[PDB]
């Protein structure tokens, strides 16, 4: 990946989102979209959204992932790394991060992830996984 995909260019799918992590008023989700650039039906686009309704702000957010040897994964820089405390008057804020996934051989996608973030005096370290991906043949038809 010298290849980037600007946010502006992504057309959302009709696939439901998938909740990756949900704790401490902090939530990560995957939205899946067809690769908007023609000529690569073996790339999944994963719009990662990170949302907070925590009473304190959330800082130092890093999201990482890994994928089977046979496929690759790239993470474009996130829109940001912190979130404001919940405020009833303002609109909720989101961090967005684009995540690219190359599956030439077209096998079942699994994904591990690490999430580090800070909230007050506390740091959090999560490691887990995701397997609710759209079947790899469908990656052109969404």
């Amino acid at each position: 990946a010298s290849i980037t995909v600007p946010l502006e260019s992504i057309k959302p799918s009709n696939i439901l989102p998938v909740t990756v992590y949900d704790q401490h008023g902090f939530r990560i989700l995957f939205h899946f979209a067809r690769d908007p650039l023609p000529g690569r039906s073996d790339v999944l686009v994963v719009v990662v959204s990170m949302l907070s309704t925590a009473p304190q702000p959330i800082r130092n957010i890093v999201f990482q992932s890994a994928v089977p040897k046979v496929m690759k994964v790239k993470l474009q820089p996130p829109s940001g790394t912190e979130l404001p405390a919940f405020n009833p008057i303002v609109h909720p804020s989101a961090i967005t991060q684009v995540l690219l996934l190359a599956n030439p051989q077209k096998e079942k996608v699994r994904l591990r992830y690490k999430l580090t973030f800070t909230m007050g005096d506390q740091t959090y370290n999560e490691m887990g996984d995701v397997d609710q991906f759209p079947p790899p043949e469908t990656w052109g038809s969404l």
Binding site: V62, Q64, A66, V67, M71, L75, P77, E107
Partner: peptide
């Protein structure tokens, strides 16, 4: 199918 290394973004 064993896993690759963890990737992150250029900070």
């Amino acid at each position: 199918d064993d896993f690759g290394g963890f990737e992150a973004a250029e900070t």
